[PDB]
Design a protein around this ligand. Structure first.
Ligand SMILES: COc1ccc(Nc2nccc(-c3c[nH]nc3-c3cccnc3)n2)cc1
Length: 294
């Protein structure tokens, strides 16, 4: 099994989900996600998605293997993928600023990965919603494009059967990026499009995160996570509910963006991701089309 051939080298990420390690396999870097015992259903769902859906795409993290192994005489669930030395988009945006070309390339590549996920393809894949899009779940590739990672919460739908497959995972999305209908708990869980629009909301927040780091008129904003100014680290459910639903707050558009053609376009995009009413938001394909034009 691939797990027994890998040498773990250093831990590059850690959370309640478990750990991500840079490992060595066949003399190349690979990412090894070692799930915690509390998050076995995410391992199962990711393994299911990668093994039963043809998911290869330039902007979707590339799957190598999924294994059960023994470490310290007890079972570990491993998910092995391609390694991206440039790291997560979250970490990357803190280490550099962007120019116009690099900013558009990042957000367009994310829109292409997302649209590919959302679209059903025949002759071939079901439609897939992600449900935990965020800059920590997006990796930066050496060519300046990004790829979307972590399918542990994904939901699938296929037209031939009209079957919705929401999995069996008690994990919920990252609270900071949850759409209003998730926080007020009125989202219609029996309908696939409900989940696509939860992704669109989160993608709006990612767009905002990246745009702040594009230089115009020689100035740039510091990296900040969405809603940094109004919720603490690790915000609770009620924190996000108060800010997003009750007070209807949205991320602030800096004045300097409106003096730049690109950032004004991006600002209109993200605002149409943020309607309180999910039906009003743009779709991934519409966002991809618009971004390709700018
Ligand atoms: C600054 O320190 C760092 C340097 C490099 C990296 N490189 C990297 N390469 C591939 C994947 C991931 C990753 C991040 N989040 N989740 C995954 C993942 C991995 C496997 C399966 N599913 C999700 N990170 C990370 C941190």
């Amino acid at each position: 099994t691939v797990a027994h051939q890998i040498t773990l080298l250093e831990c590059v990420g850690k959370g309640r989900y478990g750990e991500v390690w840079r490992g060595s396999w066949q003399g190349e870097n690979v990412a090894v996600k070692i799930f915690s015992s509390r998050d076995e259903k995410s391992w199962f769902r990711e393994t299911e998605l990668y093994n039963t859906v043809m998911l290869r795409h330039e902007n979707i993290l590339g799957f190598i293997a999924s294994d059960m192994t023994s470490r310290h005489s007890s079972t570990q669930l491993w998910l092995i993928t391609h390694y991206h030395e440039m790291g997560s988009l979250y970490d990357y945006l803190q280490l550099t600023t962007l120019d116009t070309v690099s900013c558009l390339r990042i957000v367009l590549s994310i829109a292409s990965g997302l649209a590919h996920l959302h679209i059903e393809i025949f002759g071939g894949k079901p439609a897939i919603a992600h449900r935990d899009l965020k800059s920590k779940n997006i990796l930066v590739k050496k060519n300046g494009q990004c790829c979307i990672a972590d399918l542990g919460l994904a939901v699938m739908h296929s037209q031939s059967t009209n079957q919705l497959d929401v999995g069996n995972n008690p994990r919920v999305g990252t609270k900071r990026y949850m759409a209003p209908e998730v926080l007020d708990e009125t989202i219609q869980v029996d309908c696939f499009d409900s989940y696509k629009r939860v992704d669109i909301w989160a993608f709006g927040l990612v767009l905002w995160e990246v745009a702040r780091r594009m230089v115009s008129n020689g100035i740039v904003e510091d990296y900040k996570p969405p809603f940094y100014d109004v919720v603490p680290n690790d915000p609770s459910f009620e924190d996000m509910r108060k800010v997003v639903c009750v007070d209807q707050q949205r991320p602030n558009i800096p004045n300097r963006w409106f003096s730049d053609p690109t950032l004004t376009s991006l600002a209109k995009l993200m605002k149409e991701c943020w309607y309180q009413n999910p039906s009003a938001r743009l779709t991934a394909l519409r966002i991809k089309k618009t971004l390709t034009k700018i």
